[PDB]
Design a protein around this ligand. Sequence first.
Ligand SMILES: O=S(=O)(O)c1ccc2cc(S(=O)(=O)O)ccc2c1
Length: 159
Amino acid sequence: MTDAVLELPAATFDLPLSLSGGTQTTLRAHAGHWLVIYFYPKDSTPGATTEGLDFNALLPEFDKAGAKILGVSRDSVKSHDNFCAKQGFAFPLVSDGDEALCRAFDVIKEKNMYGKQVLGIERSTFLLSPEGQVVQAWRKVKVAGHADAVLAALKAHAK
Ligand SMILES: O=S(=O)(O)c1ccc2cc(S(=O)(=O)O)ccc2c1
């Protein structure tokens, strides 16, 4: 069986991504190097912490490959700062408050939860090439062994 590849909206290229301390970046700024964008549901949860620390454990290998990592959730910069102060992630956390980046990658899903319908981030990750192409995607991500799988995919597509 086969499926259709992801098509990002043209506006995604320079969407300003809110980081900490009134600073920001863009996907455009990452051209020339591999990029891993991982979306997680909520700051300070066991799953978000484990996924982030797993990427921390592999950062030296990602760095060797010249790749950069960006974690993303809809939480505020303040929330990210707290999460950051407690776990110490060696990479930036994007505060996608207006869900612009989440919608671009189509990770916002509606699910029957807590006795009602809830819109939120479906844990997903994307690997982008130095040329800005989405090379591989992971949706409905299971945290265990995920960062390992992303690094393995990177190595398979690169050198
Ligand atoms: O993937 S888990 O099942 O660990 C998970 C993680 C964060 C969540 C956040 C919400 S939120 O809608 O309250 O932010 C709801 C369900 C969640 C499930």
